[PDB]
Amino acid sequence: MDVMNRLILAMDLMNRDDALRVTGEVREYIDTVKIGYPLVLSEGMDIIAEFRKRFGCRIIADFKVADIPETNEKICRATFKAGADAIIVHGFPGADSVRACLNVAEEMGREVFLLTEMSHPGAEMFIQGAADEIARMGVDLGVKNYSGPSTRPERLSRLREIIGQDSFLISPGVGAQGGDPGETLRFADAIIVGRSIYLADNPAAAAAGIIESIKDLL
Amino acid sequence: VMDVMNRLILAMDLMNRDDALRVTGEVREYIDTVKIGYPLVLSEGMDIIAEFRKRFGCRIIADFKVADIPETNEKICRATFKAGADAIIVHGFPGADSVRACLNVAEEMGREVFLLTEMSHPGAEMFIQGAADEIARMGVDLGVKNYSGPSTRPERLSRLREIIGQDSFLISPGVGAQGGDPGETLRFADAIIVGRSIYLADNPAAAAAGIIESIKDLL
Ligand SMILES: O=c1cc(O)n([C@@H]2O[C@H](COP(=O)(O)O)[C@@H](O)[C@H]2O)c(=O)[nH]1
Ligand SMILES: O=c1cc(O)n([C@@H]2O[C@H](COP(=O)(O)O)[C@@H](O)[C@H]2O)c(=O)[nH]1
């Protein structure tokens, strides 16, 4: 997956007008948008097609899929029907639940991103202790796309070690949560950035600024 | 705690509005509490909650297995309660801050959180099972009053009931299609969740009535 400027916009605004306006303002800097439940549950799954129509960006559906296999399959089918190119799936619920998503993605020509360790403080309680094993499970299952935490570069580096240089790794927690763009890109292929861009006085300038700070990494 | 008619919650995971409405309407005399998850919501929109309330007047549990960072969890809960859900199901494995974010919105909006502890499917044994007792204890410490645990593992369901105490409300999926027994599950759970055994039946109303007949002495 070739992500422009190694930068994925986390579009978590919850109003269609604002989400479209802000995304349009930064469109010259990105070609990949992560759309999650804040926007989808506020404006409907049709928002995905609207983004494709307006911006011709790739869309990652950040749905943190975390159900039993049968339900996971249904969620993935509905998500890909809406035009998402990829979906983010939790590894913590186990291998059968991940495989269910992999199967639908294969059937529909899409990608699964396996979320190993999360970026927020609560991730330390249960997820962190399982994360290396979740990553190995990904490798065993043939997963090629992963998410790990910008807020813990030593953990992000370990995840990169487990999955190898050929796998694709994206990383949230940059900016608002404390992660550094350049340090994160030592290990991740692409950074996810939400609030530092979409809550900025000038989102275009914010995106341009981040890209300037990593210009040697492009 | 919510008064679930017949101790039976319908997991409405059909993905078409017409079928979902038909089946729910057919079992309405037996069930006043419906769990609506992402299979239906992602297919038909959040307005499906509005339509269920309008048509059936059933309580709605939004089964969204909320599993994000605190800031995103808050947004998800706000959107879900805005649409009219009575309650939302939240994962505990992402930790206490993520759960607290959901509790804070539920408190502000006058709605409820259900904390998902252990899950019912085989994969739950890999990571969730080993964290589940602590997730439940965390819930108790945070003031969580509503929980979900697995019908498919009676020994685990019993332990989770012990941890949360008799006053907490416990619902349990995995009954029927996944192998759990209604009566045995109700030894520990306040209510059972049933999906496919009802909604894939030739006669969903007869399926629901049959389940209820089998647990009549527990009502
Ligand atoms: O570990 C993770 C995984 C995520 O998907 N995310 C998501 O990435 C985005 C981070 O946005 P922000 O840059 O505003 O912190 C949010 O959409 C959040 O749901 C995260 O923050 N941490
Ligand atoms: O541990 C759990 C938690 C759940 O919410 N569920 C949900 O409960 C329902 C089970 O439906 P069924 O009776 O068709 O197996 C599904 O909606 C599933 O997503 C589960 O099966 N196991």
Side-chain angles (χ1 to χ4, degrees):
Chain A
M1 181 179 296
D2 187 347
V3 172
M4 177 179 297
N5 289 319
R6 300 178 74 181
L7 175 66
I8 299 169
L9 175 65
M11 180 36 64
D12 298 315
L13 291 173
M14 296 171 73
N15 163 279
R16 181 178 164 275
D17 287 347
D18 294 337
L20 293 173
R21 182 180 48 84
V22 172
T23 303
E25 284 169 5
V26 307
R27 68 182 298 177
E28 67 186 292
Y29 300 107
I30 64 167
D31 64 2
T32 307
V33 178
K34 186 176 74 64
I35 296 181
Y37 285 136
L39 182 52
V40 158
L41 299 182
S42 296
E43 297 289 359
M45 287 290 274
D46 287 352
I47 198 68
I48 294 172
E50 182 87 329
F51 271 59
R52 287 180 64 160
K53 185 171 301 182
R54 289 194 55 150
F55 309 120
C57 53
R58 70 168 59 70
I59 300 294
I60 301 170
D62 181 7
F63 289 177
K64 300 288 186 314
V65 182
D67 219 302
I68 70 171
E70 288 82 352
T71 297
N72 278 11
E73 175 183 344
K74 294 179 183 73
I75 294 173
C76 292
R77 290 186 187 280
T79 297
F80 298 143
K81 180 182 181 172
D85 297 290
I87 195 169
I88 297 173
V89 174
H90 266 294
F92 207 84
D96 55 355
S97 286
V98 176
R99 177 56 67 189
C101 301
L102 291 169
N103 290 340
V104 179
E106 185 188 354
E107 183 168 4
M108 303 188 61
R110 317 294 161 96
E111 297 293 331
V112 168
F113 281 77
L114 184 64
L115 176 54
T116 63
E117 184 168 333
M118 292 180 70
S119 61
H120 64 298
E124 293 187 351
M125 295 190 27
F126 308 110
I127 292 173
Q128 181 174 81
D132 286 10
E133 188 176 355
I134 294 171
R136 291 192 307 272
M137 178 189 70
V139 176
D140 287 342
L141 289 171
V143 172
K144 296 181 185 176
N145 305 283
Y146 298 80
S147 180
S150 173
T151 51
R152 306 190 191 93
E154 85 285 20
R155 297 293 304 136
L156 188 65
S157 176
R158 181 66 186 131
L159 167 59
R160 168 59 75 188
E161 287 178 343
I162 294 166
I163 70 187
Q165 305 293 161
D166 289 347
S167 297
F168 192 73
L169 176 57
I170 68 182
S171 183
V174 177
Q177 295 178 59
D180 181 80
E183 286 296 291
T184 301
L185 292 173
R186 291 172 65 189
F187 310 112
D189 295 282
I191 50 172
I192 291 164
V193 178
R195 287 165 287 171
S196 288
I197 295 172
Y198 73 69
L199 291 186
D201 289 323
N202 181 346
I210 292 168
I211 294 163
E212 175 67 13
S213 77
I214 62 173
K215 62 94 165 60
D216 288 336
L217 285 43
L218 307 179
Chain B
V1 305
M2 61 169 63
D3 182 15
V4 175
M5 186 178 291
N6 292 314
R7 301 180 74 183
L8 176 62
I9 300 171
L10 176 65
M12 177 36 63
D13 299 312
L14 294 173
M15 298 175 68
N16 158 278
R17 190 183 306 257
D18 292 337
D19 293 333
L21 292 171
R22 183 193 71 254
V23 172
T24 305
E26 288 176 355
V27 304
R28 186 196 208 257
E29 67 193 298
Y30 301 107
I31 296 169
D32 68 359
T33 306
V34 178
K35 187 177 74 64
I36 294 183
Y38 283 135
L40 182 52
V41 160
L42 298 184
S43 296
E44 294 292 354
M46 290 291 278
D47 68 352
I48 198 68
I49 296 172
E51 196 168 11
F52 272 55
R53 288 296 297 177
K54 182 178 176 295
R55 288 273 303 266
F56 314 124
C58 53
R59 293 187 200 87
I60 299 295
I61 299 169
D63 181 5
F64 289 176
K65 293 188 181 58
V66 184
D68 219 302
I69 72 171
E71 183 74 342
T72 296
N73 278 10
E74 289 190 21
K75 294 179 174 81
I76 293 171
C77 292
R78 290 186 187 288
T80 297
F81 296 140
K82 177 179 182 180
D86 291 278
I88 196 171
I89 300 178
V90 176
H91 264 295
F93 77 77
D97 54 357
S98 290
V99 176
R100 185 165 51 249
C102 300
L103 290 171
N104 287 343
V105 178
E107 173 68 29
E108 171 179 333
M109 310 186 67
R111 306 290 164 82
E112 301 199 279
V113 167
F114 281 70
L115 184 66
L116 176 56
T117 63
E118 185 165 331
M119 291 180 69
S120 63
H121 66 296
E125 289 178 358
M126 293 187 46
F127 307 109
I128 291 169
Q129 181 173 85
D133 291 349
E134 187 174 351
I135 289 166
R137 189 163 77 251
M138 175 191 74
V140 175
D141 186 60
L142 293 175
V144 174
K145 299 176 300 177
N146 305 288
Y147 297 83
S148 181
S151 173
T152 51
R153 300 191 194 90
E155 77 280 11
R156 298 297 301 133
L157 190 64
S158 173
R159 178 66 191 133
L160 296 157
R161 166 57 76 187
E162 288 174 354
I163 296 169
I164 67 181
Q166 304 298 147
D167 288 346
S168 297
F169 192 67
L170 178 56
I171 68 182
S172 183
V175 175
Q178 297 178 57
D181 179 82
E184 285 300 303
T185 302
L186 291 175
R187 290 173 59 188
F188 311 112
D190 293 280
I192 51 174
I193 294 164
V194 179
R196 286 166 286 174
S197 291
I198 291 170
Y199 73 69
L200 295 182
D202 287 348
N203 186 340
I211 289 162
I212 295 169
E213 177 68 15
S214 78
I215 64 174
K216 181 176 180 57
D217 289 350
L218 308 178
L219 303 177

